[PDB]
Design a protein around this nucleic acid. Sequence first.
RNA 1: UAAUUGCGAUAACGAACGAGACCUUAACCUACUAAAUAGUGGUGCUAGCAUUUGCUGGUUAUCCACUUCUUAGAGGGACUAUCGGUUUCAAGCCGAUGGAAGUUUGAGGCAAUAACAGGUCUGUGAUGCCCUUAGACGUUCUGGGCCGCACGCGCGCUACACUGACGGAGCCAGCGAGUCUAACCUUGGCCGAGAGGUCUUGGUAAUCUUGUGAAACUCCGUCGUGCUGGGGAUAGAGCAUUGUAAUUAUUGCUCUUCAACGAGGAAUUCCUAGUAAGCGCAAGUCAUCAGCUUGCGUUGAUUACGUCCCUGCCCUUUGUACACACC
Lengths: 145, 67, 143, 70, 141, 63, 60, 80, 206, 55
Amino acid sequence: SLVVQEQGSFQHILRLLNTNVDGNIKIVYALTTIKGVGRRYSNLVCKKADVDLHKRAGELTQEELERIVQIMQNPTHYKIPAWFLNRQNDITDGKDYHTLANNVESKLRDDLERLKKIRAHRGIRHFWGLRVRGQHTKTTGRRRA
Amino acid sequence: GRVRTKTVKRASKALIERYYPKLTLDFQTNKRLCDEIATIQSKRLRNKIAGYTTHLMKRIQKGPVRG
Amino acid sequence: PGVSVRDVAAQDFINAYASFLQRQGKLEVPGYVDIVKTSSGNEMPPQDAEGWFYKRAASVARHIYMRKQVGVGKLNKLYGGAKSRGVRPYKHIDASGSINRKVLQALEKIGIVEISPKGGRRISENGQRDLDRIAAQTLEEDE
Amino acid sequence: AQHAVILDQEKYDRILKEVPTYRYVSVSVLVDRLKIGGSLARIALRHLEKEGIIKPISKHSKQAIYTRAT
Amino acid sequence: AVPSVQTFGKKKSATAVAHVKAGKGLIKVNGSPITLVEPEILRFKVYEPLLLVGLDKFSNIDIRVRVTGGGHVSQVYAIRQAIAKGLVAYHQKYVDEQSKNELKKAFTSYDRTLLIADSRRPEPKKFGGKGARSRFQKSYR
Amino acid sequence: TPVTLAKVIKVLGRTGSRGGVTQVRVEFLEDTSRTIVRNVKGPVRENDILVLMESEREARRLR
Amino acid sequence: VLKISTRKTPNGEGSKTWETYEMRIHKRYIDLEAPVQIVKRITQITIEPGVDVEVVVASN
Amino acid sequence: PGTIVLYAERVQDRGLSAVAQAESMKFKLLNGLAIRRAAYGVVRYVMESGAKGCEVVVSGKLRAARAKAMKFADGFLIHS
Amino acid sequence: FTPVVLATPIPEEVQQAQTEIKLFNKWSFEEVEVKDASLVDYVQVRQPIFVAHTAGRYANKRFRKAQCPIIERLTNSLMMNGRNNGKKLKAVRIIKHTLDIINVLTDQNPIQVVVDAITNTGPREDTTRVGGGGAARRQAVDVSPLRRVNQAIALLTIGAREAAFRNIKTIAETLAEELINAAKGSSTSYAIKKKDELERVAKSNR
Amino acid sequence: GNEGAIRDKTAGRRNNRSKDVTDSATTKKSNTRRATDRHSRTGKTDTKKKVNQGW
RNA sequence: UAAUUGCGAUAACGAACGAGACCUUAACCUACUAAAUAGUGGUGCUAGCAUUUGCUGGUUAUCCACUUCUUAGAGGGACUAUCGGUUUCAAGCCGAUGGAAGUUUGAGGCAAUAACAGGUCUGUGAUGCCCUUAGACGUUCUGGGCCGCACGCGCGCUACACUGACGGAGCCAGCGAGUCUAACCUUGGCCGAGAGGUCUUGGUAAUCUUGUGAAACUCCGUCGUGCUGGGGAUAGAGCAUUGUAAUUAUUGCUCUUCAACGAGGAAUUCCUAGUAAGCGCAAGUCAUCAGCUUGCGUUGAUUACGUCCCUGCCCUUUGUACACACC
Ligand SMILES: [Mg+2]
Ligand SMILES: [Mg+2]
Ligand SMILES: [Mg+2]
Ligand SMILES: [Mg+2]
Ligand SMILES: [Mg+2]
Ligand SMILES: [Mg+2]
Ligand SMILES: [Mg+2]
Ligand SMILES: [Mg+2]
Ligand SMILES: [Mg+2]
Ligand SMILES: [Mg+2]
Ligand SMILES: [Mg+2]
Ligand SMILES: [Mg+2]
Ligand SMILES: [Mg+2]
Ligand SMILES: [Mg+2]
Ligand SMILES: [Mg+2]
Ligand SMILES: [Mg+2]
Ligand SMILES: [Mg+2]
Ligand SMILES: [Mg+2]
Ligand SMILES: [Mg+2]
Ligand SMILES: [Mg+2]
Ligand SMILES: [Mg+2]
Ligand SMILES: [Mg+2]
Ligand SMILES: [Mg+2]
């Protein structure tokens, strides 16, 4: 690239999606401070909104942002494969959704209490505050209870 | 740290005991002497046997020595 | 004087092929190079993101030229690197099979590689005809 | 995430006249003066080479050594 | 059929096969010029045989080398030895012996495995620990 | 800072408990045909040279 | 070189001592220019207990 | 049938090949011979039978709950 | 310099100084003199080598380690900590960089300020652990003419090695800034500090 | 059953970390009669003019 | 001296087992024997750029020659050689030169007499005796368990990063294995982000899988010192594979969740040259499952070249009432 210097376009901090973001960090790495967002789920949507990531966050004049979220809140209507998201076939409607930062803490419990209400052994496990994926528990995970 | 075994040392003295006409002060000459004058079983073995006889015969031309 | 591909440095040459092929136009990208990480063993996709297909198609040819014939599998192993299986030891695995399988078709339709007999894909003859031309163009850097 | 890791409009002036009097330079030397982070500093390095600012006695990536315009 | 020889250079596992033709001074290892091999820092390690013996000594020869086995550094050390031994091999058959005795002398005065093939070799591991001489950790109840 | 010129003429042996030291008689390259037998820490051969701070001092075998 | 690495103890006690066994195989092929009646001439006194003999036919 | 047939060939000077004598004592002790007597017999036999050296060890229990072990060897014997 | 050209291109950059006064990749091997009476015969320069990578057995005999190019023995003393065990190519690259520097600032050839860096980082005197009986004191000892340099090189690296930890400055710059202070030790090089304190206690026994 | 497993209290790392470990966990080898090995405990011996008949 | 290995001293002289010899493997052969299942030169046939004839390839035989590389047969080679230093100038030792090699040449293999209440009746259709034997401790079938989790100990794996993680790109090994009554190793063409799917072929193998294009490593960038993009536990949701069966999630991939961990107290381990350490690979295991092991090569140090202080064990002397020998 080359050196660039805007006048006042860069804003240090600006909240969105009920989360904060440092403007002094790159925007293809800043946005991943939200829940349900990853270093890859971000990269995909970034140039899909024809935005150049080479610059930081206080950059990227608002118009883009206003619908940058719309592309993730509506990830299938806007050309993204449905094997790239955290919630496919959900649990009761067969749809494919992406849950991002407030519903994720909720949806975790949604399935969690679902297995509990169903009495599934792994629900039992969770309720006991243990390892649910079958890993040996005698010699591991001792003091963080 | 390789002190030769007395197996070779016992042999070296027993040949210098009866072959001084022969047994020049050179190893290679002495080496090809054993294949014809001795019944050794291996190159390496006769190599230290002949290589030793040489040192003994190299010193006899300086003075006498036990054995 | 008469140059050859071997007579040019690997990196500053395929990167010349990249700018050339990038600015040429006949690509036939499968359209899905927005996402693919290029291997299961890789953490994230390449950083060019407008390109890196020409950079891969740069050395995708360089290699096929220097050898008799090659196949999809061999390419996967070549670029494929070590994968940090988190807390488990690193291990090597082949790269993505389609990003290679049709990086060839995307470039054999352009005519720089032939589906060689005996199984595999040989450097095309016209691909062999643009052997030194691109090599020479890079010698023009230190003319 | 601290200490001016972006353009810094009035800092752009500082880097203009700070390049002289320097016998050494590198991406480290840039952030070493209450300045811009390495990411923006890195590509700014030869943005100076565009016209008589440095002497690139260095060779490659991960280590750079320029020198006073002669 | 012109005056030509063959020689080799052997590092730990790498073997370098060099053929020296009577030509116009061409040196292309595996088909690629010696100008740039790959280990840019280790480049001079193969350039030095030419620089040490006087650099021209090529006007009527042609060398090209292939390297199987080895590693990114095992092969670079085997080619230099292969070409040095090659040039002295040429000077044995087609030129006099003094111009050759001067070359092996100019080599051995600086030789770093240039003509005498380094005899080092990987040692085999013995059960009781992953390593040649290394042993597993002990407990002591 | 007064320094000394000391070249080891010959070596005596390894003194010290663990054997990491050794008595060594040296010669002053200044006013030669001298002594003292001082001791060292690193591995040494004959003909070596080394500086000593106080030459008016010498310790014998270490316990 | 057919190698067999196995612990010496039948049980799993004592020092973990391993033991590698070896079996070496040698196969030699010869292409001939003989007639159609010496087919069985060097077929019987060709042997010495321990050498597996195998004769082949043309290249197709 | 016909793919194989076996022929019996007596072993030349059986008292040099160990297996022969090993089984010899087995059938000697099994017939009530004194351990020392039967063992010593095969050793003197194997020696007068040509062998440069011989050795035989008997381990286990013989009427004594504690297992003993006796060695019987004659002549020359290399081991390394 | 009587250039010679043939079929394969031999750049004039390598063609200008090969048989000319032998220099390093970019620095003269001549003019580098040990500025300490001791350490002579133990700082191998003259002979020269253009790059510090030599597959030479230096431990099959006790003292062969001394006739080894000292700058090379400095390099390999960086590829340590497991993290760098092997990696000599990464190391040697850091050295070429480090010696491109201090030259940037210090006009003096780098293979000269390097010998100046090890000369003043040798613990002329040191201490030991006398038996003494129980609560033992220390005995004033004088390091050898090669443990002197061995300790000197080890001191310099370990000091710069830790300096490069958790900080943006490159391992190359730390070693560079360590050797400049070590050229003639002045209150900052981790090496001279540890040495004088491994020496000021050598007087605590006398 | 499983409904019993959830409803039933006293389970879970909470209902368990609350307690203390039986000091028997930090126990030792309890050497298995290894200081009496050389002394036959059979309480019987082998006659001598029984072994001279056997050996 | 590694060695009861020798010198030397010597009422002892001369010998054998064991150490050595020996055997195997890794290193030296332009000297012998030659090989389309190994490879080289020429030449046909053949393709690119440059022309001036060149440079870089294609070619299951187009032919011709060869054995340097490869391979494995037969030899040879080293004997610590030469010179010197040290020493009863004895065994020996040490330095230099030469040398493929001069640390038992490196690494193994084998290994005498004795000793243990060492482990193994859970390898054995090796076994003494005892127990049980038809509601069986036999045996098979169904399911569960060996994984079960307030904790204590031990062998490990991944990290705490900038000698870095990441992304392009450069891109080099070696020890192995591998399908007949068969389902083993798998190239290659497609489909698939991936995992994987699918369509054919080579191979019972120096012939095909494979130059195993392995990984660290080299290069060019993005990142910027902030738990950060270092880190990858835990966890949710989906797609695959193994398999009669994957729930307590066999393994693989994808997205998301993003712990502790900012170099580790007292303590203790392994190790001296291609070794340590970093790196991945094959093999055992194996339907699926390596954070295990056994081998391999890859990149390649520091500091020793010494002592008996610590620790352990030998050997004398010595006491002994022990000899079932200090249990
Ligand atoms: Mg996140
Ligand atoms: Mg005869
Ligand atoms: Mg790779
Ligand atoms: Mg790669
Ligand atoms: Mg990892
Ligand atoms: Mg590992
Ligand atoms: Mg040959
Ligand atoms: Mg020498
Ligand atoms: Mg017991
Ligand atoms: Mg048993
Ligand atoms: Mg059952
Ligand atoms: Mg278990
Ligand atoms: Mg263990
Ligand atoms: Mg990388
Ligand atoms: Mg799909
Ligand atoms: Mg078939
Ligand atoms: Mg973080
Ligand atoms: Mg990560
Ligand atoms: Mg530490
Ligand atoms: Mg496996
Ligand atoms: Mg296991
Ligand atoms: Mg007594
Ligand atoms: Mg007691």
